[PDB]
Paper text:
Synthesis of hetero-oligomeric KdpFABC, a P-type ATPase, is controlled by a widely distributed TCS consisting of the transmembrane histidine kinase KdpD and its cognate RR, KdpE.
To determine the structure of KdpEDBD, X-ray diffraction data was collected up to 2.5 Å resolution. The C-terminal pair of anti-parallel β-strands (β11–β12) that form a β-hairpin structure constitutes the wing of the wHTH motif. The 15-residue-long, solvent exposed helix α8 of KdpE contains five positively charged residues that can potentially interact with DNA. Likewise, the α-helical and β-stand elements of KdpEDBD superpose well onto PhoB in DNA bound conformation with deviations restricted to loops connecting α7-α8 and α8 to the β-hairpin structure (the DNA corresponds to the PhoB recognition sequence). The corresponding residue in KdpE is the β-branched residue T217, the branch point sits close to the peptide backbone, which makes it unlikely to penetrate the minor groove formed by T-rich sequences between the S1 and S2 half-sites of kdpFABCBS. Mutant KdpEDBD were incapable of binding to DNA in EMSA, even at a 1∶8 molar ratio of DNA to protein, which underscores the importance of these residues in stabilizing DNA-protein interactions.
Residue numbers in the entry: 5 to 105
Write the structure that this text describes.
Amino acid sequence: PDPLVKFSDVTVDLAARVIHRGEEEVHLTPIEFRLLAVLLNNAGKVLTQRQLLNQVWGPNAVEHSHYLRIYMGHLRQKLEQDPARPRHFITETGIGYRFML
């Protein structure tokens, strides 16, 4: 299963909770990391906003859909070449999100 995930200039050790780009250490927030993980562990699958709020928080569903948008933004800001044009952290409009690689 291998807890060492690599996608662009980013390498993420899921076990240690550490991330390098590309590479020196990018520092994530504990919340931003549980979301990265969930996303990394569902690579390529399209996940609903409720699915994501469930897996990151649990009773923070669903009346807290905005936190998910705010933390996707943070993830893009830190990990994406162009936060405005994500290549890995992809939105499925009206549904949820999809992570590539």
